[PDB]
Amino acid sequence: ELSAFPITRKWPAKHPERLQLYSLPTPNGVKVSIMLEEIGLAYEAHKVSFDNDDQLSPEFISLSANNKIPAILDPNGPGGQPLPLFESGAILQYLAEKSGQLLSQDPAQRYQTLQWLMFQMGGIGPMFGQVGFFHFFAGKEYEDKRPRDRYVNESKRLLGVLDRHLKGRQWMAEEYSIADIAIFPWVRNLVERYNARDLVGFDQFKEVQRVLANFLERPAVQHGLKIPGAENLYFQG
Amino acid sequence: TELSAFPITRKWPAKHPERLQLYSLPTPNGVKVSIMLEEIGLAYEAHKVSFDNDDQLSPEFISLSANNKIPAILDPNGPGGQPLPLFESGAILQYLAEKSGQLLSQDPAQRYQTLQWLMFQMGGIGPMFGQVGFFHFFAGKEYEDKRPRDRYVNESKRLLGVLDRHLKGRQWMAEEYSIADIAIFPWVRNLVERYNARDLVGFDQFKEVQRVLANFLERPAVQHGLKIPG
Numbered sequence: 441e442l443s444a445f446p447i448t449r450k451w452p453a454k455h456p457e458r459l460q461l462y463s464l465p466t467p468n469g470v471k472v473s474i475m476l477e478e479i480g481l482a483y484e485a486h487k488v489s490f491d492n493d494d495q496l497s498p499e500f501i502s503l504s505a506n507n508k509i510p511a512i513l514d515p516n517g518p519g520g521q522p523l524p525l526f527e528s529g530a531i532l533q534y535l536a537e538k539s540g541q542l543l544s545q546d547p548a549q550r551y552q553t554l555q556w557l558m559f560q561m562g563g564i565g566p567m568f569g570q571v572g573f574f575h576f577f578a579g580k581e582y583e584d585k586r587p588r589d590r591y592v593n594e595s596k597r598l599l600g601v602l603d604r605h606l607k608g609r610q611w612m613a614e615e616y617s618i619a620d621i622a623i624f625p626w627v628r629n630l631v632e633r634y635n636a637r638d639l640v641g642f643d644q645f646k647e648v649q650r651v652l653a654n655f656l657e658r659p660a661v662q663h664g665l666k667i668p669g670a671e672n673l674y675f676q677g
Numbered sequence: 678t679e680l681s682a683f684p685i686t687r688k689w690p691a692k693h694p695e696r697l698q699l700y701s702l703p704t705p706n707g708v709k710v711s712i713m714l715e716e717i718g719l720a721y722e723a724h725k726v727s728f729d730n731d732d733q734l735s736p737e738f739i740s741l742s743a744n745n746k747i748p749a750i751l752d753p754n755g756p757g758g759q760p761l762p763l764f765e766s767g768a769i770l771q772y773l774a775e776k777s778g779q780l781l782s783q784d785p786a787q788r789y790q791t792l793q794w795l796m797f798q799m800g801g802i803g804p805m806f807g808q809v810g811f812f813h814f815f816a817g818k819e820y821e822d823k824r825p826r827d828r829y830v831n832e833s834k835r836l837l838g839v840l841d842r843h844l845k846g847r848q849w850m851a852e853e854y855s856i857a858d859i860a861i862f863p864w865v866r867n868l869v870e871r872y873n874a875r876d877l878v879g880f881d882q883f884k885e886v887q888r889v890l891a892n893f894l895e896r897p898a899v900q901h902g903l904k905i906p907g
């Protein structure tokens with residue numbers, strides 16, 4: 441019964457028995473594609489193009505109320521009923537709990553993982569994103585650099601928190617988890633796409649560098665970083 | 678493990694070591710947790726972490742709360758009866774809901790909708806309303822270039838619209854009062870009261886947000902939690 445969800449009018453399901461992903465390769469979108477690749481859950485990816493204002497369409501918003509990617513529609517949700525969901529961090533937790541992977545069953549570790557996920561969702565994403573605005577997008581042209589410097593300094597502070605935490609450790613929690621999947625695409629985005637490597641003094645965070653490199657070596661990460669592409673759009677036009 | 682193993686307790690000793698320890702300040706994020714504790718009826722001992730004194734930047738505080746922020750907790754009666762340290766208001770809300778079996782629906786689909794709205798709060802409402810505070814109420818108000826202010830004001834208006842349209846015909850964010858309401862409404866109150874941003878964000882227009890906020894503020898646990906720690 442996916443036809444009850446208007447999003448499917450705009451991105452029809454070729455495989456309605458599979459989880460539907462509505463996304464774009466961005467630091468938030470790739471959290472979810474990476475997660476799906478890691479856990480081996482079948483899914484059907486759909487490209488939501490910002491160039492066409494797709495994320496502002498009534499069909500998209502009918503599921504993803506905040507007009508943002510990523511969003512999912514899982515036909516095999518609780519009770520075998522479809523589950524609509526947005527917010528990358530909520531989707532990560534949902535998928536971890538659904539699959540039993542990448543979120544510890546040990547309660548204390550569960551909560552430590554959720555803590556670091558929330559740190560990402562409130563700190564890393566929002567603050568690194570402002571560095572992008574003030575160094576890579578329109579804000580880069582603003583002559584008054586006090587705003588830029590606010591967000592750069594805060595991003596450096598957050599990197600320091602990560603760096604100190606990761607000393608002596610492989611991952612944020614005792615096992616690789618959704619907290620890593622949430623954080624490291626954003627670290628990558630800051631130092632690659634936003635061209636902010638020197639601005640945030642990245643070379644001083646040796647532990648973050650080490651763990652980022654380990655993250656990027658993972659085959660599921662390399663796949664998930666690239667998904668969705670456009671091929672799922674072509675037959676429809 | 679015993680509570681003295683956590684260096685935070687050197688600076689804020691536990692007078693009641695059998696009780697959950699809260700390290701907080703009356704702020705939109707701190708009151709999420711004090712409100713939650715009041716709602717669920719769990720005993721706790723609150724400690725004031727003074728921003729005026731840079732307490733949140735002390736080594737003792739940071740030893741538990743690694744991001745140097747309030748709120749944080751240390752629950753002696755954590756899972757398996759072992760002490761559990763935790764920071765991030767949204768994580769603490771999930772923890773307390775799961776510990777108490779309150780304020781998350783038994784319907785897992787409703788639980789996930791609730792967690793969605795909690796993440797919307799944690800990534801959108803808190804960070805963006807907080808920037809309106811900086812650029813309207815605190816020192817960023819002095820900046821002659823208003824493009825940053827307007828960026829955050831416009832985004833805050835957009836977020837309020839999302840809430841407002843969602844709340845039409847509803848009492849709460851999910852079908853029952855939940856941790857998502859507790860996360861969101863203290864921030865709405867902060868924006869319009871503390872930051873004096875009521876005209877700035879055109880708050881008058883969000884009739885559903887106003888209605889639900891008013892209901893929220895009538896709850897006794899909310900009134901009590903707003904003032905803790907004193």
Ligand SMILES: N[C@@H](CCC(=O)N[C@@H](CSSC[C@H](NC(=O)CC[C@H](N)C(=O)O)C(=O)NCC(=O)O)C(=O)NCC(=O)O)C(=O)O
Binds near residue numbers: 528566
């Ligand atoms: N909390 C949400 C954030 C989702 C999100 O930001 N999605 C972006 C693409 S990810 S790309 C990263 C994203 N940037 C943007 O969205 C750029 C556009 C924005 N309106 C602006 O002016 O900065 C960002 O900084 N995010 C901060 C964070 O993660 O907390 C989107 O759909 N934008 C469409 C739109 O805005 O119309 C989540 O985790 O899912």
Ligand SMILES: N[C@@H](CCC(=O)N[C@@H](CSSC[C@H](NC(=O)CC[C@H](N)C(=O)O)C(=O)NCC(=O)O)C(=O)NCC(=O)O)C(=O)O
Binds near residue numbers: 558707728746767811
């Ligand atoms: N994600 C964390 C956020 C916690 C948080 O922001 N705590 C504040 C007090 S709540 S008061 C609201 C808070 N403001 C501030 O923290 C003001 C100081 C800041 N450094 C600045 O320059 O703006 C804010 O805007 N928060 C955004 C959000 O909730 O996402 C704190 O301890 N600050 C100490 C410090 O910065 O040294 C959570 O949910 O627990």
